[PDB]
Write an enzyme that holds these catalytic residues in place. Structure first.
Site, PDB file in Angstrom:
ATOM      1  N   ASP A   6      16.075 -17.881 -53.789  1.00  0.00           N
ATOM      2  CA  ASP A   6      15.765 -19.106 -53.095  1.00  0.00           C
ATOM      3  C   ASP A   6      14.561 -18.802 -52.184  1.00  0.00           C
ATOM      4  O   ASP A   6      14.739 -18.241 -51.128  1.00  0.00           O
ATOM      5  CB  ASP A   6      16.902 -19.501 -52.219  1.00  0.00           C
ATOM      6  CG  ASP A   6      16.623 -20.775 -51.420  1.00  0.00           C
ATOM      7  OD1 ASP A   6      15.632 -21.510 -51.725  1.00  0.00           O
ATOM      8  OD2 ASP A   6      17.429 -21.066 -50.510  1.00  0.00           O
ATOM      9  N   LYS A  67       5.596 -22.535 -47.287  1.00  0.00           N
ATOM     10  CA  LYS A  67       6.002 -23.405 -48.378  1.00  0.00           C
ATOM     11  C   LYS A  67       5.383 -24.792 -48.156  1.00  0.00           C
ATOM     12  O   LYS A  67       5.047 -25.504 -49.096  1.00  0.00           O
ATOM     13  CB  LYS A  67       7.536 -23.488 -48.421  1.00  0.00           C
ATOM     14  CG  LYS A  67       8.130 -24.212 -49.604  1.00  0.00           C
ATOM     15  CD  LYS A  67       9.687 -24.157 -49.507  1.00  0.00           C
ATOM     16  CE  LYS A  67      10.396 -24.188 -50.840  1.00  0.00           C
ATOM     17  NZ  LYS A  67      11.919 -24.326 -50.671  1.00  0.00           N
ATOM     18  N   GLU A 171      15.483 -26.786 -56.706  1.00  0.00           N
ATOM     19  CA  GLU A 171      16.542 -26.373 -55.796  1.00  0.00           C
ATOM     20  C   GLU A 171      17.916 -27.094 -56.070  1.00  0.00           C
ATOM     21  O   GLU A 171      18.946 -26.412 -56.227  1.00  0.00           O
ATOM     22  CB  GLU A 171      16.025 -26.425 -54.343  1.00  0.00           C
ATOM     23  CG  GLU A 171      15.020 -25.256 -54.077  1.00  0.00           C
ATOM     24  CD  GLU A 171      14.120 -25.432 -52.878  1.00  0.00           C
ATOM     25  OE1 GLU A 171      14.338 -26.372 -52.118  1.00  0.00           O
ATOM     26  OE2 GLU A 171      13.157 -24.613 -52.684  1.00  0.00           O
ATOM     27  N   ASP A 195      21.100 -32.298 -49.053  1.00  0.00           N
ATOM     28  CA  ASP A 195      20.649 -31.026 -48.552  1.00  0.00           C
ATOM     29  C   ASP A 195      20.103 -31.185 -47.145  1.00  0.00           C
ATOM     30  O   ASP A 195      18.955 -31.564 -46.951  1.00  0.00           O
ATOM     31  CB  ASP A 195      19.599 -30.497 -49.519  1.00  0.00           C
ATOM     32  CG  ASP A 195      19.041 -29.109 -49.152  1.00  0.00           C
ATOM     33  OD1 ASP A 195      19.360 -28.524 -48.090  1.00  0.00           O
ATOM     34  OD2 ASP A 195      18.264 -28.612 -49.993  1.00  0.00           O
TER      35      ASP A 195
END
Ligand SMILES: Nc1ncnc2c1ncn2[C@@H]1O[C@H](COP(=O)(O)OP(=O)(O)OP(=O)(O)O)[C@@H](O)[C@H]1O
Length: 377
Positions: A6, A67, A171, A195
Site C-alpha cells: 500500500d 502521492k 486501493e 475509506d
C-alpha cells in the site's frame, strides 16, 4: 517471493502471503505501517520513521505527501492547493512539479516519482529484512481516481526502486480482495468502499461478478477526516480551560500541542471504551488540566461531521446510478472507520447489508494486495 505494497499518502504498508495467511511486515522500528516521508539532511537521506521523527528539527527539507504530486502537472488544482500547506519548496520544471531541498550542503530537486521511489525502496527493504530473501515482485496499489499519467508515474517509481511491478491495483479493489469478495459466486454485486483516514476520505462503488471487478463511481471529501474530529475536541477542551481558569491557552503552541496529542489519544480510546480521562500537569501558566470525556460527548461534538460522511456516499451512488438498496457490501478501511458511531450510521443507512470491517482498517489495502501478488508471481 511477492509482496503487496500500500503506497500511502501519509503511511505505507507492506504484506506478504505465506503459510496460507497474510503477514503484515513490521519495519526496523517495529511498526506495521511506515511514514511515506523522506528527509534530506547535512549528511544523509532518511526514510520512514527516521524522517518523520525529525520533521520539527528540519521541516524545510522533509518531504511528504508526494502521492499528492505524483504524475500531476504543476498547474493541477491539487498541487496548487496543497503547496500552501507544505514547508518544503515545490518548483515548476517546465510543467511538472519538483521538490527542492538542501541535501549534503547542496540545493537538490526530485520529481515526486523519485521521492515515491525512495519510500518503495524502503518498503522493499522492510520485506527483505523480514524474509531473509531478496524481494522484487510487488503488487502496488493506487487510488481509483488515478489517471493514466499518475498510474504510470507510480509504476515507474516501483521500477526505479528495483521492483518488478506485477500489477497496479486500485486501493478499494485491494480491500475487496482482502475480504475474499472476489470469491463470491452467482449474480453481480455492488460493493461500496468507505475509506476514511486522517485527511483523505474516499468512497468507491465497484461491481464484482465472478471475480471480475469494475469501478462504477468514485467520490471524495478533501475536507473531512480524523484531524477534524480532533479539532472539535481541542475547541471543547480549550473552552473548558477558559470556563474554569479564565486563561487562553490558544496563543501557546506547546500547550495547544500537548492538548491535541492528548485528544488524538483519548479519541482512539473512545473507539473501544465509553470514556477517556486526560491529565496534563502544568498545561498553561503552571495550571494543571485534568479532565475526562465520554463517548457520548465525543460523538455529539462531532455529530454533524459524522453525518456529513454520508454525502460522498450519496454522490457516489448517484454517479453509479444505484439506489442505496442495491448495495450488497460495505467495506471499511482507513483508521477513522474504527469510530463506533461511524460504523452505526453506516449500518443503519445500509439497513440489513453486510459491513466488512474486521481486518485492520490501516492494513486491508496491503492485505489484499499481498494476496493478489502471491497469485500473479
Ligand atoms: N482507534 C481509533 N479511533 C479513532 N480514530 C482512529 C483510531 N486509530 C486511528 N484513528 C484515526 O485515523 C486517522 C488516520 O488514519 P490513516 O492511517 O488512514 O491516515 P491517512 O492520512 O488516511 O493515511 P494515508 O494518507 O496513508 O491513507 C487519524 O486521524 C487517527 O486519529
Amino acid at each position: 517471493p511477492a509482496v503487496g505494497i500500500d503506497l500511502g499518502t501519509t503511511y505505507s504498508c507492506v504484506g506478504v502471503f505465506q503459510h496460507g495467511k497474510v503477514e503484515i511486515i513490521a519495519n526496523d522500528q517495529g511498526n506495521r505501517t511506515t511514514p511515506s516521508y523522506v528527509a534530506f539532511t547535512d549528511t544523509e537521506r532518511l526514510i520512514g520513521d527516521a524522517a518523520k521523527n525529525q520533521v520539527a528539527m528540519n521541516p524545510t527539507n522533509t518531504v511528504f505527501d508526494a502521492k499528492r504530486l505524483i504524475g500531476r502537472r504543476f498547474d493541477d488544482a491539487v498541487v496548487q492547493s496543497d503547496m500552501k500547506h507544505w514547508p518544503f519548496m515545490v518548483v515548476n520544471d517546465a510543467g511538472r512539479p519538483k521538490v527542492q531541498v538542501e541535501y549534503k550542503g547542496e540545493t537538490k530537486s526530485f520529481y515526486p516519482e523519485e521521492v515515491s521511489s525512495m519510500v518503495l525502496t524502503k518498503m522493499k527493504e522492510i520485506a527483505e529484512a523480514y524474509l531473509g530473501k531478496t524481494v522484487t515482485n510487488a503488487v502496488v496499489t493506487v487510488p481509483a481516481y488515478f489517471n493514466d499519467s499518475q498510474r504510470q508515474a507510480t509504476k515507474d517509481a516501483g521500477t526505479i526502486a528495483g521492483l518488478n511491478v506485477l500489477r497496479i491495483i486500485n486501493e478499494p479493489t485491494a480491500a475487496a480482495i482482502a475480504y475474499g469478495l472476489d470469491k463470491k459466486v452467482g449474480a453481480e454485486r455492488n460493493v461500496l468502499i468507505f475509506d476514511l483516514g486522517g485527511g483523505t476520505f474516499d468512497v468507491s462503488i465497484l461491481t464484482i461478478e465472478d471475480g471480475i471487478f469494475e469501478v462504477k463511481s468514485t467520490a471524495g471529501d478533501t475536507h473531512l477526516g480524523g484531524e477534524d474530529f480532533d479539532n472539535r475536541m481541542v475547541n471543547h477542551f480549550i473552552a473548558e480551560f477558559k470556563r474554569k481558569h479564565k486563561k487562553d491557552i490558544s496563543e501557546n503552541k506547546r500547550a495547544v500541542r500537548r492538548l491535541r496529542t492528548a485528544c488524538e489519544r483519548a479519541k482512539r480510546t473512545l473507539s473501544s471504551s465509553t470514556q477517556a480521562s486526560i491529565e496534563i500537569d502544568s498545561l498553561y501558566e503552571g495550571i494543571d488540566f485534568y479532565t475526562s470525556i465520554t463517548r457520548a460527548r465525543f460523538e455529539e461534538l462531532n455529530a454533524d461531521l459524522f453525518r456529513g460522511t454520508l454525502d460522498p456516499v450519496e454522490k457516489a451512488l448517484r454517479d453509479a446510478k444505484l439506489d442505496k438498496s442495491q448495495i450488497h457490501d460495505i467495506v471499511l478501511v482507513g483508521g477513522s472507520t474504527r469510530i463506533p458511531k461511524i460504523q452505526k450510521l453506516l449500518q443503519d443507512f445500509f439497513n440489513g447489508k453486510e459491513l466488512n470491517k474486521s481486518i485492520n482498517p490501516d492494513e486491508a489495502v496491503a492485505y489484499g494486495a499481498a494476496v493478489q501478488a502471491a497469485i500473479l508471481s
